[PDB]
Every structure is written in structure tokens, then in C-alpha cells.
Structure 1
């Protein structure tokens, strides 16, 4: 049995494009990723996801919808990352570059999988098909999956 820490991940997914952020520093630097971070005490997971989206991208949203949950385990780290994945309902402002993320839009036939976390290649297509999912991925370092599980679910 491990302990888990709560994280969020928000995909700003529109009919023909997705907003991703180029991580400028820290965990997963150099890759494109959705927007998110650690849930804080007292806030709901959804509200933490909205907060992190605003802090990281500049976008404010009134509501999200949950699309998945992914547990990440890293060799040499006993704590699991329990990542709650959301998609935006609608957006109403422009993304802003920050110290941590440079946002950029990608057309949905140009999803930059080779420059994203390797697990995204498995679960992001489900997000595009509007399918909810549970996943688990064990990593050696940042590049190598040693074990994983991915399941479509009716309820996240």
C-alpha cells in the first residue's frame, strides 16, 4: 500500500484544437502538457483544477467536466500521483505565457505526442472520443513505461 497525493490536469479541448502548455521549469519540463498542479487543502478537486488552470494559463472558467483519473508511480518514489483529469466546458479569455507554462494551440491532427508525456499517447485519444477513463502508469524516469493499465469507464 502506497500513499497518494492529489493533482489536477485540465485539457482545454475545443472542436478542432487543444491548448497545451510547454513546461518551462520543474517536473516534466520541456514537454507539452495540460494545465494543473497539486490540490490544496479545503478546495474541491474541481475547484483546484480551475485554480491551477487560471494560475498556469491565465484562463478562467466557471465549470469543468471530469473525464478521467490517472495514477502515476515512479521508480524510487514511494508516493503515487493521483491525477484527476478535466476538460473545459467553455472559455472566455486568452492564454498567457508565464514562468511555468507557455501555452499554444494545436490542431487536432497535429497533437504533439512525441513531445508530451508518453502516457498521453494512450489516454488522450479517449479524451478525443469523449470516453471516460481510469489509468495507471509506472515510469522509470521520465521516458520509460514499465507497466500500465487503461480502462474505459462509465463514471470517473
Structure 2
């Protein structure tokens, strides 16, 4: 019982784009851009669509970098998050009622204001490693258990 989500990191040689979510799921935290995959839509097409919706940016090729499954205790559905990165975008990041984008130098990624699991897998993304992870959460702040391994094929 899992539901598909996407997550896109615009990762350039010296900086990464994140968005401050203003409401709803994950509000108040910096995040990549993504959301639910639609009926009849490929995961990658969903990732490209959500990047545009949430950041205003157009991406062509997206590179698969990981899969992370999230369990929230007390919630039936697991989140099956397909993570992608890109270094070539078009457009300029757009602030909307839903998200405030902002570039971060790689040594200044705001982990204290991000979901706590990101501290584990972001360093792999930064070194161009691919991964499979699982995180069991209680609430939005507490990781009860996790696994995380590097893979050759996402």
C-alpha cells in the first residue's frame, strides 16, 4: 500500500535550489519540488510537471538518483518517493503562494530547517551517488528507524 511521489533537486556545481513550503504538507521547511504522480502519467513526466508548478522552471532530461519510502506511524499509506536531479533548467525560479525558492551554496544547505531524513541522503546526492532509503517517522520530526544504502541502479 504505497503512493507514488516525485522529488526534484536542481543541483548545479556550486549551489542547489530549494523551496520554502508555505502551507500544507511540509510547510515551514525547505524542500525540493515534487508531488503526487497522476493517472496515466509517467513518474518522470510527473516530476517535470511538479518542478514547473512549484518553481516555475522547465527541465528536459531528469536523472534518477534515488527512491525513498516513508512510513508515518498511524497512517496506512507509505510514500514511495522517486528522487531526481537536474543541472540544466530554463526560466527563473518563481515565488508563489505555495513555495518560495532560494539558491543555497552547498556548504550552507539548511538542514535544520529541512525534513530530518535529508541530512542522511543529501550528502549522497551531492557526491552523485544513487540510493534506496526507508524512513519510519513518528509525526513530522522524529525518525524512529531507517535504512539507507547506495545502489548502482535506482
Match of 1:91 in 2: 89
Q: Give 3-state SS (helix, strand or coil) of 2:25's partner.
A: coil
Offset of residue 63 of structure 1: 1.2
Deviation of residue 89 (structure 1)? Answer: 4.0
For structure 2, which runs of at least 5 residues remain unmatched after alignment?
A: none
What are the Cα deviations for residues 33-79 of structure 1, in whole angstroms up to 9, with x where unaligned? 00000000111100100000000000011110000000000011010
Residue 65 of structure 2 contacts residue 131 of structure 2 at CA under 8 Å; is this kept in 1?
Answer: yes
Runs (4 or more) in structure 1 with deviation over 6 Å come to none
**Is the Cα contact below 8 Å between 1:65 and 1:89 reproduced in 2?**
no
What SS does structure 2 have at the residue aligned with 1:6?
strand
Contact persistence 2:12–2:87 (CA under 8 A): no
How many residue pairs are counted as aligned between the two chains?
154
Distance across 1 between alignment mates of 2:78 and 2:71? 5
Note the aligned Cα RMSD (angstroms): 0.6
Give the whole-Å Cα distance in 2 for the aligned partners of 1:54 and 1:45.
Answer: 14
- Find the aligned partners of 1:84 and 1:100 in 2 and give their Cα distance: 21
Kept in 2, the 8 Å contact 1:63–1:89? The answer is no
Which TM-score applies when normalising by structure 2? 0.99
